[PDB]
């Protein structure tokens, strides 16, 4: 039910602004893309020490309200607002597991919620809307932290408006 808030105490906007997700426990690491399996292009969303503050994200709901609440199902994307590229999804892929990846399509209602956790927020993934959520955490591999389902062990972020 609560409004999601940025590091300056302002409500997070619905698509209008981009935000850095700043991890509280891995301060020297930012959002980036990396290769997973035998893939040519980097499509996995990671926290990378050589990428700080990292690529910023937008949070999008079809609801015609200009702020985001913890109860809204969201698309999360890199890049511009009205685009369909850089859209986060969760895809089973070795060696990571339920890996957060980027794709080039965007459903009406995305599968994510942003929920308060400790001193910031966690990203929670919903396989379907009626169900309980799965925390997004980190899989440490190849000197980076792949975002993946890790229920019980969320990566806690502060949300800093890109400006």
């Amino acid at each position: 039910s609560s409004v999601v808030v940025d590091t300056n105490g302002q409500p997070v906007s619905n698509g209008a602004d981009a935000y850095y997700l700043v991890p509280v426990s891995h301060g020297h690491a930012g959002l980036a893309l990396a290769k997973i399996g035998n893939e040519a292009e980097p499509r996995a969303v990671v926290l990378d020490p050589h990428h700080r503050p990292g690529r910023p994200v937008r949070f999008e709901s079809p609801l015609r309200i200009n702020i985001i609440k913890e109860s809204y199902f969201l698309n999360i994307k890199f890049g511009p607002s009205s685009s369909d590229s850089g859209v986060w999804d969760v895809i089973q892929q070795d060696p990571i597991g339920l890996a957060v990846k980027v794709t080039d399509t965007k459903s009406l209602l995305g599968p994510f919620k942003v929920e308060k956790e400790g001193e910031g927020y966690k990203i929670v993934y919903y396989p379907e809307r009626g169900q309980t959520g799965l925390d997004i955490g980190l899989v440490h591999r190849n000197d980076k932290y792949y975002l993946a389902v890790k229920d019980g062990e969320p990566c806690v972020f502060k949300i800093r408006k890109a400006t």
């Binding site: 209008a16 609801l63 015609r64 309200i65």
Partner: protein
């Protein structure tokens, strides 16, 4: 509102803004003490602002009245967007004047092709963002339920209708939520959702107020 026009001061006197230090939703004054808005606009300690045309300045014709009760529809489902309606009882009666008047509830449902007035202070752009100082207005027709369902497969219930233009260019948008859709002088819709704003084949989706009139009347009667 994308592709709309400046309403003008006295033109939409039943429009209110829902405020918690910032404007976040529209609403409609349905009598001196009751406002209807969208369930997804629910927030603690809502202040309703009435008589506003320019949201960013204290014009003096304003009335700022706190909500005393905010009643989300008991079947509101945050997973499906169904039953997206809320009633706010104001703590005191609004004083009615040239810029503050109530909109009445419909006696029956509106038909496809009927022209409606949709208003709000939401985003005026289909790509990017720009928020107006003054209230914006749009004339938009109700679309058939079949074409609404073709536009958004699996997501349109009996308590929603589409309105606008499958061509694009003219629509409600972010910041318009909870605001009025008025057809034949009666409140027929509440701004709810859509895929983007003013995009081809992605019309606005509105809460179908004619389905809720008995619930609204009962709720007002008992509270």
């Amino acid at each position: 509102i994308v592709g709309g026009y400046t309403c003008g001061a006295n033109t939409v006197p039943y429009q209110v803004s829902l405020n918690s230090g910032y404007h976040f939703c529209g609403g409609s004054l349905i009598n001196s003490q009751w406002v209807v808005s969208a369930a997804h606009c629910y927030k603690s300690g809502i202040q309703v602002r009435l008589g506003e045309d320019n949201i960013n300045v204290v014009e003096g014709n304003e009335q700022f009245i706190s909500a005393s009760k905010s009643i989300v529809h008991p079947s509101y489902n945050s997973n499906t967007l169904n039953n997206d309606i809320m009633l706010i009882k104001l703590k005191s009666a609004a004083s009615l004047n040239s810029r503050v008047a109530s909109i009445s509830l419909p006696t029956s449902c509106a038909s496809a092709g009927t022209q409606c007035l949709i208003s709000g202070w939401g985003n005026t752009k289909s790509s990017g963002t720009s928020y107006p100082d003054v209230l914006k207005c749009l004339k938009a027709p109700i679309l058939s339920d079949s074409s609404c369902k073709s536009a958004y497969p699996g997501q349109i219930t009996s308590n929603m209708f589409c309105a606008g233009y499958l061509e694009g260019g003219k629509d409600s948008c972010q910041g318009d939520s909870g605001g009025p859709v008025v057809c034949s002088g009666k409140l027929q819709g509440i701004v709810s959702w859509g895929s983007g704003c003013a995009q081809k084949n992605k019309p606005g989706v509105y809460t179908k107020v004619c389905n809720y009139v008995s619930w609204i009347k009962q709720t007002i009667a008992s509270n």
